[PDB]
Amino acid sequence: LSFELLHAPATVCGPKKSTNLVKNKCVNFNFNGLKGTGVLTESNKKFLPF
């Protein structure tokens, strides 16, 4: 097995950490690299697929 790492987007990362999601607690969160702190609650907002 060989790895090539050049000036490319490098879409192959592989292993990563997973965690269950909590609610109604002031908690630190990280969504797709977006860091933040706060309490999460159910949302009734209608987004778009993109």
Partner 1 sequence: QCVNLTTRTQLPPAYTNSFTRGVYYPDKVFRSSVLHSTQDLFLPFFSNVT
List of residues contacting partner 1 (CB under 8 A): 45, 47-48, 50
Q: Give the burial class of 2: count Cβ atoms within 10 A of its Cβ; 0-12 exposed, 13-18 middle, 19 or more buried.
A: exposed
Instruction: Supply the minimum distance, in Å, between the C-beta of residue 27 and partner 1.
Output: 22
Q: Minimal distance in Å, beta carbon 49 to partner 1? A: 10
Closer residue to partner 1, CB minimum distance, 18 or 43 = 43
Nearer to partner 1, 31 or 50 (CB): 50
Residue 17: what residue type?
K
